[model samples]
Target: RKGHFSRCPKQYKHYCIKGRCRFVVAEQTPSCVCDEGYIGARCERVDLFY
Candidate 1:
């Protein structure tokens, strides 16, 4: 399910479908850093090159 968490900023109000959410002080929000082989802004999609 794609949704945002409470207490997140307007820009940080987003979910990481596959990847884990991390508190990035630089961006001041919970952002998604895609995992290896995964591709997507929210890391929702995978490379599937296997």
Candidate 2:
């Protein structure tokens, strides 16, 4: 999802897993297509607490 933009404004990037990133549309939005072990509007969340 990196370097890509959805129906929303402003471009965004997705977090990669093991070395790869991943996209989406409305309902949830393309900003939620986070890689494994990640989460958030742009894959900014971590699967682990620390």
Candidate 3:
């Protein structure tokens, strides 16, 4: 796996771990569509966020 190179993900999984994300044309980047109990930069886990 270390031999892998940088490349656009087959899907948004490149950003969102849960894979629930959206794209923005205003600027450009994978914006996660945070779900309840799971919200972060890329819809990451919010298990310990104060």
Candidate 4:
């Protein structure tokens, strides 16, 4: 049963699975997003550019 209702940010999209939310970025929204830089998918990498 569901008791609450809600939605994500208007500009942002995501993929929800098993109660977990994953952000989804489109190529068209280049500036709409920023790379985690040092943080890759695992968010455990160091920055490599000077």
> lDDT of each model, Cα atoms only?
0.59, 0.40, 0.54, 0.35
Residue-level lDDT for 34 in candidate 3: 46
Candidate 3 has its poorest 10 consecutive residues by lDDT at 1-10
Number of the predicted model whose TM-score against the real structure is largest: 1
Please, what are the lDDT tens digits per residue for candidate 4 over residues 1-50?
A: 83433334534433211122233343222222323344444333446586
Regions of candidate 3 where Cα sits further than 4 Å from its true position:
1-10, 24-31, 46-50
Descending-lDDT candidate ranking: 1, 3, 2, 4
Clashing pairs in 4: none
User: How far in Å is the alpha carbon of 4 misplaced in model 4?
Assistant: 19
For candidate 4, give the lDDT of residue 21.
29
Please give the TM-score that candidate 2 achieves against the real structure: 0.27
For residues 1-50, could you state the per-residue lDDT of candidate 2 as single tens digits? 45543433223332332223223443444333334565565445577554
lDDT of 3 by residue, 1-50 (tens): 33422333546375767545555555566455545667567655676364
Error of 2 at 33 (Å): 4.2
What RMSD does each model have against the real structure?
A: 8.6, 8.7, 10.5, 11.6
lDDT of 3: 0.54
Q: What TM-score do all the candidates reach, one by one?
A: 0.42, 0.27, 0.33, 0.20
